[PDB]
Symmetry: D2
Subunit: 390 residues, 4 copies
Amino acid sequence: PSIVIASAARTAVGSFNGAFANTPAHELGATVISAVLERAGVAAGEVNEVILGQVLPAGEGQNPARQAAMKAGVPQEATAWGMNQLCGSGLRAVALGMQQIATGDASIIVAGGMESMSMAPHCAHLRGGVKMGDFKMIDTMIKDGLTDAFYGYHMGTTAENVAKQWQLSRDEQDAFAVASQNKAEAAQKDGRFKDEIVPFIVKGRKGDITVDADEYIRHGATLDSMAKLRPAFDKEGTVTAGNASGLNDGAAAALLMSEAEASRRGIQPLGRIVSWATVGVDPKVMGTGPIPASRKALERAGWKIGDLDLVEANEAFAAQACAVNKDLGWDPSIVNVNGGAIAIGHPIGASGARILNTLLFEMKRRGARKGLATLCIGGGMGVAMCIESL
Amino acid sequence: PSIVIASAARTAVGSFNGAFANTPAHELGATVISAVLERAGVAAGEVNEVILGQVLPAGEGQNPARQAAMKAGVPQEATAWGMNQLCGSGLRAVALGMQQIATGDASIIVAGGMESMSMAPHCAHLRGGVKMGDFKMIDTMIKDGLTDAFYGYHMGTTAENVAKQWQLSRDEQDAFAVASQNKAEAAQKDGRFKDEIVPFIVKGRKGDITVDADEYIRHGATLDSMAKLRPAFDKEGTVTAGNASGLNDGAAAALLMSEAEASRRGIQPLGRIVSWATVGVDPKVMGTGPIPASRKALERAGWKIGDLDLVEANEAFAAQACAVNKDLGWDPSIVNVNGGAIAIGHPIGASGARILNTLLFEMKRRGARKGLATLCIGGGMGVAMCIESL
Amino acid sequence: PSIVIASAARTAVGSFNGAFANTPAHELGATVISAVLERAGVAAGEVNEVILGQVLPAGEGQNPARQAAMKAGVPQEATAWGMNQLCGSGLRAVALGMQQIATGDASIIVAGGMESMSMAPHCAHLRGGVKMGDFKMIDTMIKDGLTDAFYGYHMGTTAENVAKQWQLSRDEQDAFAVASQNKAEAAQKDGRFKDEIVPFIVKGRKGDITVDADEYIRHGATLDSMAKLRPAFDKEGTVTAGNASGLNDGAAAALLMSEAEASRRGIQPLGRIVSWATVGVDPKVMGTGPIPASRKALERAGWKIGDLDLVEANEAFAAQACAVNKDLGWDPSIVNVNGGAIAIGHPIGASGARILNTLLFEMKRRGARKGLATLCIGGGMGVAMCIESL
Amino acid sequence: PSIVIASAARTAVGSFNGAFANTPAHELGATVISAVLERAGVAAGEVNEVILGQVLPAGEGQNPARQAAMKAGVPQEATAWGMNQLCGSGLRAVALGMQQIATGDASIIVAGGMESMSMAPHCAHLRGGVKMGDFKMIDTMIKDGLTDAFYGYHMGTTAENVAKQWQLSRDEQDAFAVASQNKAEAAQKDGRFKDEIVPFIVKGRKGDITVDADEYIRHGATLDSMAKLRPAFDKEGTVTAGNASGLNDGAAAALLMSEAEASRRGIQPLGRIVSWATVGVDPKVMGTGPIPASRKALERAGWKIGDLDLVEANEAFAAQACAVNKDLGWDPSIVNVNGGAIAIGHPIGASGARILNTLLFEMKRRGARKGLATLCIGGGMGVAMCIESL
C-alpha cells in the first residue's frame, strides 16, 4: 500500500488567552477540515473518517472530533474520533489515518490535531463532597498537559536534566532561541506561512475578526532581552520563558488517500508517507525522544540521515532541540528553516500536524524531495514521519 | 497478515461510587496489562505499545495509558497512547492494535480500555475570570461522557428516539432488562465470569479489599420492581434506571500478535480477528449504529448473519438493544448469553473491551467457532469486530 | 437606665452535618425569636429591632438577621442587623441590645446569635480569573471562623500556646473534658436543658423531625477514650478533638426591655444586666480573653469574684478553660454546673447567647442571685456580662 | 451625653475590579483608621474600639475589623468588631460607636465601614457532596449584597417598583443621573474631595500606585449617552446601569469621643451627633427607607425639615433618590451638592460613612450649621443621622 498527503492546512497559532482565547478547539478543527477538503478538491461527503489529536478536551462535550467533522459538513455516515499521545498526537493521528487506508478499511481520511489550551478548565473530584477543609481546583492544562505523572515536575524540568546532561550553556539555549525567532519573523514577513495558514474567523458581538497570522512570534527578539530573563523552573537553572515554547491554541490537518486515488481525482500531492516510528525513552529526559524515533523512521524508509533535504524537529525547549540536533548530526541550516515552536507556539495536540504543514509546504516551496518530522513527547517518548515528494 | 488475541483479561465492573470509588482508571488498566502478559506467558519487556480507550481522563495526569503501562512494568521502551470513540473506544483500541501489526509497525500490543466514571471531576473554564454572576460547575462525566453535543440532550433521550421509531413498549423493555439481569445472575453464580476476571486489589489504609465480582449485578431482579420505576429522561417516557445501564468503573484488554508468532510461542489463542468496521448513523438515533457496523464487518469477514455462533451486542439501552435484535434478526438465544451491560455495568471507555472479553471466553467455553461483538456510540456511530477461534 | 432580660430561649445544639446539616441559620434564629416572644407574653408587632451575632453568613442571602425577624412575624417596620465579634458575638449582641434601650432608641429588642457551621460554603475569588495554575477552594468555616488572621494557624494552636504558658498537662485537660461530658450528660438526663431549649422542627420530604435535645453530648464518655486520641494541631501537642469543643449549629436569644417596662407588663424577668465588658489580649493566647473581660465586668458591677453564685465560662478548649479558672480562682463547683461547650458544642456566633441561656435558667432553678457569662474570642479578645436576679 | 465627631477620612472610591481590584477591604480600613487618628491628633494607643460595617467579608479571614485595627497600630488591648445592616452599615456603625461612649463603656471609638466588592468570592455549599450533575457557584456579592431575600429579585427591581409607584419617568431619572455626574465632576475638579480623601498606596511588584481620586466619576457625561442605555432589570423598565449606582470598593470612618473630651484635647470637631434613627419599610420598596428614617431622626433632634442647611441622601438608584426628595420636599439645591453615589460609586458597607465624610467636610467648608445623612437599605430599611456644627 502507498499513501499520500493530497493537501494540508492549519489555522494560525494563537497566543495564550489571545486571539482564540474563547474559541473551542473543534471550531478551529472544523475550519481546518473544510480547508484540506477545499485544497485537494475533495467534497466533504467523500470522507470516510476524521481523526484528531487532542490532549485537553475537558468540558467541550462528547467527542470533539465528531463535533469538528460535523460542523465542517462531513456527513453523519462517516466516523470521527480523537486520540492522545501528548505533543506527538497531531502527527501520530496522521500515521493512524495512514494505517486506516493501508488495511482497506478507508480510502480518504482527514487526520491531524487541534488544541485550545486557553479553553482548558480547572477541575475537582467532588462526588464524595468535602466535609471540611480547603480543596484544590486543578488546572488541567498543567496537570494533564505539562506535568510528568511519575516525577511530579513540569516538562521544563525534564529539559534541565537534558541540558545538564549534554552540557548546553544558558548562552547556547538563548542563541538557538533568538535564532528560532529570527527565522520565524523572516518567514512570516516573507509570506512563507501564507500557503499553509487558512484564515480563521473569530465571531464576535461587536465585530468579526479575521485571524491569518501567528501572534506568538516576537518581532525584534534580541540577545540582551533573552539573557535578562529568570529561570522559570529551576532556581539556579538555565531553561526560561525566553528559550522555551509557550502555551498556545490552534489546529492543523492533512487529507490522506492512496497515491492512485489522488491521481484518479487529479490531485497533486504535497508528499508520500514513506515511513513513521514511535519509541519510548526515560521520562526524566523525554526531550531526547526524537533521536531513536527519527532513527527508527529513517531505517524503516531506508534512508541515511544525510539524504534528508529538510527537517522540522519540534522546539519544545531550546535545551532538548539542540541536544537532538547534536546527536543526529544533520545540517542545522535545513532544520526548522521557517523557525520553530519557541517562536510559533506549542498547541500540544496540534503541534505534530502543525509542523507537518510547515515542512510539506516548504518542501513544495524549495523543491526538496525528502523530509522528516519529529517531536519529543511527555512521559518519555518520541515520534517521527518521513515524507517523499511526488 | 492474520492477527490473533493471544490473551484477554478484565477487572470486575464496579458500581458508581462503590468499590472503585476512589481508584483512578490507570490502576485498573495496570492490573489488566499484567494479567494479559501473565496468562499468555509473555513478558512485559516484549510489548511494543499499550493502546487504551478512555473517555474521561480529566484530572488523572499526563497520558494515563502510559501511566497504566509503566505501573504494569512494561518498560520505558514501549510507547502508549489513549483514544476516544466514546462507548466504542475499548473495541476500537483492539482494531487499532491489530492495525499496528498488520502494517509491520510492531510485534506485540496490549489493547483495550479503562474508565473511572467515579473519579471524573467537576470543571469550569475560569481563565477569563467570571467578572460577576453565578456560573456552573460542570460534571465532566455527563458533559463529555453522556450528553449529545448536537441536540444537547442525554443518551437516554436518544433511547426515546429509538423507542418511538420501533414502537418498543414499556413491557418489552422491562422484559429484556429482567432477563439480562437473570442471565447475568446465572453466569456469575455458575462461575462463567471467573476466567475473564482478574481480581483487583483495592489498596486502603485500614484493610486491603479484593474485588473480583461484578457488583452491579442485582440479585433477584423481579419484573414488579422494574415496572414501578419512573421515567428517568422523558417525564412520560419508557427509559428508567431499570431498562438502562448505569455509571461504572473498570478496565478490559487483550494481547495481540501475529498468528505465526502466537503459533510460535506455543500460545493457543482465544481467537483470530477476521474483520472490523465502524459506521456513522443519525445522532438522534445513535443506538442503531451496531446495525450498519455489524453488517459491514459481516461482509468484510465473508460471513452471513446465520453463520454466527455467539454475539455480544452491548446493551447501552433496552430500547436500542431490541432495535438491533429486530433489524439484524440473529437468534435471540445466542446473544448476550451471560447477560449484558444493563445487568453488568457500562464503563464507557472500557465497555468495548469488556464485552469482547465475555465473547472470547464464552467462545472457548461452549465451543463456538464464530463470534461478533458490536456497540452503539454517542454522536451516532457503531463499531463491530468479527472473531473466529483456532 | 436599668435593662432586664424578660425571657430567653435557644435551640438544641446540632452536631456538624447532623440534625441541622441543611438548615439555614436564620430558620433556627426565627424559631428562637418566636420562642422569646411567647415566653415573655410579648407580641412580635412590639419588637423594635432584632440583633443577631453570626460569623458565617456567606451564601445565606441579604442580612440573615432580617430574614429571621421576618420569618418570626416581626413587622416590616422594625429593623434588624447582624454583627461579628467571633465567639463573643451572641453575648455582645445582648449588650448592644441593652444599649439601644439605655440610649432611648428602642423599647423592646430581641438579641442573641445564630450559626450554621454545617451550611458554611467553600469559596474562591474568581473575578480576575486564574490565568494558569492551581487554586484553592477555601473552606469559609475554617478561614473566617477558626483561623487566626495574624499568625495563620488554627485556634487549636492558640490553645497549645496557653497549655504551655500555664503548664497544663494532657491529663488535666482530658480530666476537664470528661468532666464536662459527664456534667452535661447528667444535666440532660435530669431535664435541666428542657426550660431553655425550644424544639425545632426540621422540615423534610418524607417526614418532619422535631429536635429538642443537644446531640453532641457523648453519653458514657471515658477517660481511656480521651487518653487514646492523637493531638489534632501539634504533632507533639496536648489539644485533641476530645478536649476541644466541636463544630456545631444552633441559635439562641434573649428579649430585652427596661426594668420599668417589665414591671408595667407584669413580667418576672430572668435577670437584670448589671454590667458587661470587652477587652483585648494577644492573639497568640486568645483563650485568656475571659480573664481581663471578667475582671472588668466585675469592677463595673461593684462585685468581687467571691460575690458570684454561678458562672458560665465558655469551654472553647480545655487548656484555656483551665487557665481562666486558675487565674480567676472562682470556685470550680459553680462554673459550668451543667457542663460546657466541650460536651454541648460550639456554634460560633450563637455560643455567647447559648451560655447566657444556660446561666439564666440555672440561676432561676437554684435561686442564684449573682451570675457571670464570659467567652474567649479569636484574634485576642474577651467578653463578659454580669447578671443579677430580681 | 453629647458625642462629637472629632475627625473623619475616607479612601477614594474605586471602580469594580479597578484600582483596588485586589486589595482586601481591611487594608483600606487600616489606612482610614490611621488617617482619623492623625487628623484628630489622637494616638492609636488611645483607641478603645474599632467598629466597621462590612457586608461581604467572605474569604477575608477572621473578623476583618480586627485585622484593620491591628494593621493600623491599634493595640491588642483594644477591641474590634464588624456589623452588617447592608447599605446602612457604615452610618449605623457611627451610631453604635456613639452609644458605646454615651453608656460609658468607651472613651474613643473609631467607626465606619469598609468594602471590597471586587474581592468578594464565588461560593458553594459542598459538604454533603454532589453525587452527580451540575451545581451553581454563587456570586456572594450578588447573593449576599444585592438580591432581596424575600422576593428573590435584585435591588434594581425594587427601584422599578418605586419608579412605577411615584410615576418617575425614564427622562427624570436620566436627568437626575447626569446631574449627579456633573456635580461630582465639578466638585472633583475644584478640589472639594481632597479634604475628605486620604490617599491609599496600592502595593505592586512593578510599582506602588497612589490612589487619591474617585475613579468612577464619569467626566463629560451626556444626556444622550444615558438615554441610549437599555433597562438593566426589566425589559420594559426605566432603571439602567447609567441611572443606578455602581459596584465599588472603599473605606470610610469617623473618630468619636465626648464633647468634653474634645474640649480637653483642644480639638475643633467636625460635628456633634444630635440624633439618629433607623426604621423599616416593605422590602419591595426599600428605596423609600430614608423617608421615615429621616423624619424620625429630625423628630428626635427637634428639627423641622426646613432647619437643615445641607443633606446627603445616598443615591442607590435615581428612581429612589427622586422619590425621597419629592416626599421630604427639602430644597434639592442643598442635597448631594458635590454629587452622589451614581457618580461616586456605592461600596456597600462603606457607603454610609462615605456620605457622612462628604457631609461633614462640606458643612465645614460652607459653614453650614445643621446637616442630615440618610441611606436606603436592602430588605426594607432606612437609617439617618443629624449632625450640628460646634
